[PDB]
Design a binder for these strands. Structure first.
Lengths: 155, 252, 66, 124
RNA sequence: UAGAGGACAGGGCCUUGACCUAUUCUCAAACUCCCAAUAGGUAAAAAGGGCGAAAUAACUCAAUUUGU
RNA sequence: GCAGAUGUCCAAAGACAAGCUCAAAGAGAACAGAAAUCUCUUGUAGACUAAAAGGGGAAAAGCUUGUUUGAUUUCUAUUU
RNA sequence: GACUCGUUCAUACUACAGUGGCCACACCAGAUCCCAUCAGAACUCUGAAGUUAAGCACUGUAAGGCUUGGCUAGUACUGAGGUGGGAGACCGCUCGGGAACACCAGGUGAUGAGUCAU
């Protein structure tokens, strides 16, 4: 019977303990470019440009930049299909997404590895390792370090 | 009842350090530095002028994530080498140091020959925005003297004319820029009682700066600057409380 | 009589029967209402680029066809 | 040292609690008493008062000279006669707590306290 | 829910408390300092990325050579 | 199902800027008292913000003051 | 040694106490002018006689708070399986995940750009 804009956001749109107050001045210096990924976290201290309840915590790539706002394209699940949604928010409600940072660092490091590998004419595996079973080990331990364990009685 | 209980301390949230110290506003700052997100690599330089109770300082600041970068600066105490040995807190001193900051910035950027500013006192130039710094912007405030100094030095600092002395009086502005108000204060004090005048403008006299000499020395300064710009750790802490209680056993 | 007001039962099965369709994700998005004074300038850039390129190509065609 | 207590402020109060005529009379008597124009109380207009500083504060305190149990714990006092005297005395450096730039608090060593306020009063 | 220690009010040095301090028993779907499990989202390179030069623009910039 | 609220109110209770800091408590001051005004100290909001409740707010989004009518015309991309 | 603009926004706060000053901050002297009030208190302007008393800086406290680790504790809770136990309430087992309060201990900052003084 109640489906207002901010219905059910009692805790989601509340500031953290001892973290109240307006956004820091340094946040306005954040650099944003077209097509890069961005997180949508609602800052309750800034009311205009607030994202809708659903998009809090979502991620999407920027498709529009204005003087003080960002239009970001976000996937929303609607029954039987995902669909693209253009949400327009202010700067305070958006932050640079780290969802790509491991990929970017991997790209740089792998490039500077591939360069040297091709220079030395070596074949290397550039794909991630998904490490599984460990090899056999031949381990040593002082006899005074082995301790005998047996189940404890009840009390 | 005590309101300073540990629950109060535990729930207490501090302000930012600079707000706590009173240095910065953080509401003026975040509108001074916030630039249109459409425009990339546009720095929006701010002309920061801060007046101490001994001298005033001007600088050019560019906002950056790790901290502000200072591109140019000027202190009132540098006017000694330019010929002003006294009154470094003056309206005229503020104008002079704004001129100095502007000229030094243009020199560092290598654009003096292209932006001459003006002479004497009444492509697009560099744009900077005046930073207040807590002070109240009343009519005839020294921050606007510094702004006029920079504007005459060649910077494009947007401003109105309300807060120059007189809500517009260019003659009054030139008088205050040249220190005429100080000169007439000297005259009035001399004519009304010599003792207070001597005890007030003491090192003025020790520098033999006459009332009529002030305007000329400020003009000469303007042209000259224009043409050339211990801790304790837990171990000994416990040792010291142990000995303190050992002595307190019989002390009281 | 009383009606079953609501249920989400079987809706997830219906949704997954034809899969959860993803958006097509085309390469170009229409710029109809985005950043004027920027996309207008982009139009001018592109017009100039075509003018120069086509005039170079026309010069080459004329000098090769006599 | 510069730990000399001086009269930071001296406030005269007329609390009549009614409308004008008598309020105007109080305003004018305060007016010749001190040339500063008085201000009025609340308008829930019930009282008029004036705060003075400088040499005039000492002069009016001398006039009011004509107890030792009515000193506040923060180093202030006051009395009456109709008109009411109150005096807020403080050490030097009190500007720190009132200025806008780097407003702070003075240490309680620098605060006056009542004990030496009594000594100051009996010395004056 | 209980006591423990400690300088405003009533009567006859005392009584009745209030109040303060440090504790104590027990609780909240419409309480929260903290905070899971499960559930959820984004990313994991070729119509692309990186690095440079040269062109274009009426955009942007102090900048026909700043940037985009 | 549960505790409620709406069919309004506002030329300011809208806009901008500046200055200030609130509730409360303690101590002190002729009338003057539990309460009336003034001063100091503490005071993270315990006040206030038209209304229900929930969020937000301290050199403010609160209080005061100044100037105003952006509560204007037209059109997009969109969210619920 | 110090200052300006910042970052982090309590390891940075609060209370009490001690130490420190040449320019440096500041307290401080004054009100003709710009300006401001009941009030030159504040704000603004002009100063340079005095002072580290305060602000400020540093340190201290079997200090409160804050913060890191340990421990609470594989406890509480919980995903999947069970023709598991039990009359039930509830409670194991198998494959997995895994807290919190409290208590203990350590700590009480670090840093970007620029500038001044020696």
């Amino acid at each position: 019977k109640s489906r207002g804009k901010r219905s059910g956001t009692r805790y989601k749109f509340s500031k953290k303990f001892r973290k109240h107050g307006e956004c820091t001045a340094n946040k306005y210096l954040e650099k944003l470019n077209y097509g890069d990924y961005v997180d949508i976290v609602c800052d309750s201290t800034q009311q205009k440009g607030m994202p809708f309840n659903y998009y809090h915590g979502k991620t999407g790539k920027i498709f529009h930049i204005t003087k003080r706002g960002v239009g970001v394209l976000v996937n929303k699940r609607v029954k039987h299909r995902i669909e693209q949604k253009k949400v327009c928010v202010r700067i305070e409600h958006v932050r640079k997404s780290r969802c790509n940072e491991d990929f970017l660092l991997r790209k740089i490091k792998n490039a500077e590895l591939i360069k040297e590998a091709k220079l030395k004419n070596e074949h290397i595996n550039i794909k991630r390792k998904t490490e599984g079973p460990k090899p056999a080990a031949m381990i040593k331990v002082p006899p005074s370090k082995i301790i005998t364990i047996e189940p404890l009685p009840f009390y | 009842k005590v309101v300073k209980n540990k629950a109060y301390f535990k729930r207490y949230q501090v302000k930012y350090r600079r707000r706590r110290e009173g240095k910065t506003d953080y509401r003026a700052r975040k509108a001074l530095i916030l630039q249109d997100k459409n425009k990339y690599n546009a720095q929006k330089l701010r002309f920061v002028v801060r007046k101490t109770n001994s001298q005033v300082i001007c600088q050019i600041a560019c906002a950056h994530i790790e901290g502000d970068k200072i591109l140019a600066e000027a202190k009132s105490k540098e006017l000694i080498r330019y010929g002003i040995p006294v009154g470094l807190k003056n309206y005229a001193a503020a104008y002079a140091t704004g001129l100095l900051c502007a000229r030094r910035f243009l020199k560092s950027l290598n654009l003096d020959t292209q932006f001459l500013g003006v002479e004497k006192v009444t492509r697009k130039p560099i744009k900077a925005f005046l930073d207040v710094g807590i002070t109240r912007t009343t009519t005839g405030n020294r921050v606007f003297a510094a702004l006029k100094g920079a504007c005459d030095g060649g910077l494009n600092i947007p401003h109105g004319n309300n807060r120059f002395p007189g809500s517009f009086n260019p003659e009054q502005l030139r008088k205050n820029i040249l220190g005429i108000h100080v000169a007439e204060y000297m005259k009035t004090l001399q004519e009304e009682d010599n003792d207070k005048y001597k005890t007030h403008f003491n090192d003025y006299l020790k520098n033999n700066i006459g009332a009529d000499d002030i305007e000329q020395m400020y003009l000469n300064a303007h042209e000259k600057i224009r043409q050339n710009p211990k801790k304790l750790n837990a171990k000994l802490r416990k040792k010291r409380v142990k000995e303190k209680l050992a002595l307190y056993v019989e002390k009281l | 009589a009383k009606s079953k007001n609501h249920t989400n039962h079987n809706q997830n099965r219906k949704a997954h029967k034809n899969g959860i369709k993803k958006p097509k994700k085309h390469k170009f998005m229409s710029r109809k209402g985005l950043d004027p004074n920027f996309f207008r300038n982009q139009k001018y850039c592109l017009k100039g680029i075509q003018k120069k390129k086509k005039e170079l190509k026309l010069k080459a065609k004329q000098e090769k066809n006599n | 040292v510069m730990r000399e207590i001086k009269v930071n402020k001296l406030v005269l109060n007329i609390c009549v609690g009614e409308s004008g005529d008598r309020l105007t009379r109080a305003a004018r008597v305060l007016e010749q008493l001190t040339e500063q124009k008085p201000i009025f109380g609340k308008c829930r207009k019930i009282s008029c008062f004036v705060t003075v500083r400088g040499k005039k504060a000492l002069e009016i305190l001398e006039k009011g000279l004509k107890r030792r149990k009515n000193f506040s714990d923060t180093g202030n006092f006051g009395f009456g006669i109709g008109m009411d005297f109150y005096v807020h005395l403080s050490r030097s450096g009190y500007r720190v707590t009132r200025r806008t730039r780097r407003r702070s608090k003075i240490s309680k060593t620098h605060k006056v306290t009542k004990e030496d306020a009594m000594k100051w009063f009996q010395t004056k």
